[model samples]
Target chain A: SGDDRELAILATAENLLEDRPLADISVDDLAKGAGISRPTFYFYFPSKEAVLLTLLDRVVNQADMALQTLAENPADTDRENMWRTGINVFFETFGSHKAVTRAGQAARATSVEVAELWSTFMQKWIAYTAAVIDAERDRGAAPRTLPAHELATALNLMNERTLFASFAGEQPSVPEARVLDTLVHIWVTSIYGE
Target chain B: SGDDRELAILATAENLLEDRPLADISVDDLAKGAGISRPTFYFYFPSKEAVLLTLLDRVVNQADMALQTLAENPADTDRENMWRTGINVFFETFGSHKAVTRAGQAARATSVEVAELWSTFMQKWIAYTAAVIDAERDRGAAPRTLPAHELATALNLMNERTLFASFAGEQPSVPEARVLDTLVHIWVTSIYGE
Candidate 1:
């Protein structure tokens, strides 16, 4: 029942985030919205940020799964096509949970704990990306000059920033597909020199 | 006298940020630190955020000037080396004003006007980067698959995110030089594909 109440609180907050920023929401409202009392909300989570952190953990789990599945199966012959699908799926996952992720990104700047959680998530993604980069390099399918880990970190961060801006509706100059194509180009060329 | 006082206020805020987060600083402390009364501080800027916005204007002006100068010089023979220097200079400028820029970056997450200021600066950098990419593509030195403007936007955003995390000491997994080299590699290979 405790875990159920916690998940209920997270889901309700995430629903609210779709319409308003975390700063705009109140704990009392969150508790009521989730069908719980203010005291119950406190028992489950310390603050709205705690709820957001929990929500982000759930979102990242799905995103990581999508990318991990792609990374595990290398399309040696159609690596470019496979890479494009992988990138699109990654962005799609973030797009599906745009509001919570956007709030999480903003919270990262202000909350040390949230920032650490984000850093840990990024490290996991970087490791996944690096492993693929290393395997490709060994097969002579990717460039060997740049270290796999460094390239992986850069590529992952690039996607992270671009998606943050694009989903947040900041980059009006570039269309969504153009942004995706640009990243795939960078990733493919940086790794495969194509 | 008024202009001098405002400048003094801005400088004091910048110095204070070196040791603490922006939220920790109040209008009273800001005014007293600048050797002015709180009322006098209000006369120059509406809020501490206004002071930060003013400070960011100064820093962006310097950063904009650096990129503009680099964009003007077309290094055909050693474009990769030139691009590396251009990026290093860009990050170096951000590094020099680490505290204020870092504060500005955080404020952008919460303040609409601050976010717009940051966006305007990014747009300017994107335009400069796009011009170079277009020239390289037209010269048949770079790939024409992705639009120059889009590619520039992606690249610019990548640097913005990676450097933000690196300078803020968030991504401890990747070393500073590796981050820099990774960005340069992505930029050089994405544009030149070599």
Candidate 2:
């Protein structure tokens, strides 16, 4: 429902990010975007940066929800397909809110809150991924290669940087479709062998 | 210009980074390490971050120097050996200055001035990698599975993030020797096929 002022603030910020960067948007801009007053904006957020940190949590949580479809749970169990789905979902979650996610990442530079917050999310994701890979190893669906956590760390890091490049629009040579396939290929071949 | 004094400050920063993060370091520390005074430190640089920016250039250029070795001579043209050399050299360059590299990464995300310097280096590095990769493909040494630049972007992006994880001192479970092996494994297996 379009009832909550907080939601309105978030929605407007997300919409604004699609067209511009986090730095350019002022509190007045956010308030205007949400059809509210500048003074009213302060009621919902401590600062403009606070809205960004909040949006970051939303985007990351959205990705975490999508990750439920991976082999860790009861949905599709094929290893490659599961990774493909997870990564595809990962991209969608971050890609849709490109500027927010990008701002979230960049904000980590000076924002201890965002950096620690991101670290917490990353560690949980890595642990979950490692546990899932270990489950496959225990079932003999996968062979032991690099330790599960280390391998998981590398793959997840790959996802982070690769997606950053995509969102930043730096490498036009790499089409989104090709990017997906190459990532999936790396994941499958690394875990299950080519 | 007291070029040697400037050199001493840069050297002191590099030496100090071996033990602490750039954030923990102070201009006082820089001055003391360089055998200079606080005001004298300003004579050489405006702020602690300026020293980092300068150190950032040096560290990146050092990496650029190591990469030249890989692009110029790749273990006598063997695919597996070349990737091993490339990945190995990457670690050596960044690992040699772990803190400086880490600060450079963090600064790039937040600081516009640092961002441009880092971005320029990355574009060149990516371009150089793409050409080397395309050369291998042309020589029938590597597969044409992914576009040279796309694969270059992907692989380098992988290196950037994975190295960040390592440099940040996360995942204490995975020893660095194993990290290099896993990175090499991904590169060789993906480019050369199993």
Candidate 3:
């Protein structure tokens, strides 16, 4: 029953986020939407951001699984397709949770804890990608020009920036597909350049 | 003169930004810091973000000058050095204005006008970079694998994300120089890969 209540609270928060930023949502709204009292809500999470962190942690875990799958298959005969699959998995996962992730990202400006959590997720992805890059280089499948860790960091940051802009609709000039294709092209070429 | 007072208000806001997120800084604080009233602060700019935009515009203009310098010298025999110089110019300009730029970027979540201004600045940089990419491609110095505009957008976003993370001190695991080197490597390889 507690798990159900917590899930309801998270669902309500997600719905609320669709219409307003997390900062705009209050504890009372979340509790009432979940058919609970404010005290009950606080019992499960300390604050609004805690609820957000829980949601982010879930999504990040799913993304981590996707990255792990990709990392395990570095020698897939069609390296480009494998990388594209991995990218789409990432894009799709993050895209589905755009509002919450964007809010979490924005909150990092003021919230030290959120920023730390974000960095942890980022480092996890970077390390996984770095391992894959190193593995590919060993097999003569990727470039050895840049360090594996740094290459992973740059590529991951490229995805984060491009996707964030597209979600925010900040870059009206760039079509969504073009953003994806351009990123994939850069990733593929940066590592496997002739 | 109005110009002198406006510059003072802008300078005060920039200084404040160094210590806190824009949302945390009240207009009253800015007005008081600049020896003005709240209404007077509103007289020059519609909102605090507008002040940020003014500061951002100044830095962006400075960055534009650097890009123009690179654009005019695309025929430089040493393409890598020219590009590196342009990259450094961008990094330094943005680095010097890290707090304001980061605050402006985070402010995009809550302020539509700020988001639009940020996008406008981004579009300017993208167009400038696209021109350089196209010029290099024309000279057979860069790849034709992706459209110049898209490539420019991706590279600029990559820098934006990486630099912002570094400024926020989120990715302490990655060294500052390594971050710079990684981005430049990606830029160089994405465009010039054989």
Per-prediction TM-score, please?
0.90, 0.85, 0.86
- Give the per-residue lDDT of model 2 (tens digit) for B81-174: 7677777776888888787887787776557788888778777877887887788788987777766777777777887778767767764224
Total clashing pairs for each candidate: 0, 0, 0
In model 3, state the lDDT of residue B64.
80
lDDT of 3 by residue, A113-174 (tens): 77788788888878877887888899988767887887888788888778877776767344
Cα lDDT of model 1 by residue, B68-113, tens digit? 7766775565877878888887678888999987898888766888
| Best-matching candidate per TM-score | 1
Two-way TM-score contest, 1 vs 2, winner: 1
Report clash pairs, candidate 2.
Answer: none
Candidate 3 wrongly placed segments (more than 4 Å) = A70-75, A172-174, B19-50, B73-75, B172-174
For every candidate, the chain B TM-score is: 0.92, 0.87, 0.87
Candidate 3, chain B, TM-score (2 decimals): 0.87
Off by over 4 Å in 2: A1-3, A35-40, A69-79, A135-141, A171-173, B16-47, B70-78, B110-113, B139-141, B171-175
Sort the predicted structures by TM-score, highest score first.
1, 3, 2
Q: Supply candidate 3's per-residue lDDT for A171.
A: 70
The window of 10 residues in a row where model 1 chain B has the poorest summed lDDT is B170-179
Scoring model 2 with DockQ, what do you get?
0.43
Residue A167 C-alpha lDDT in model 1: 80
List the pairs of residues colliding in candidate 3: none
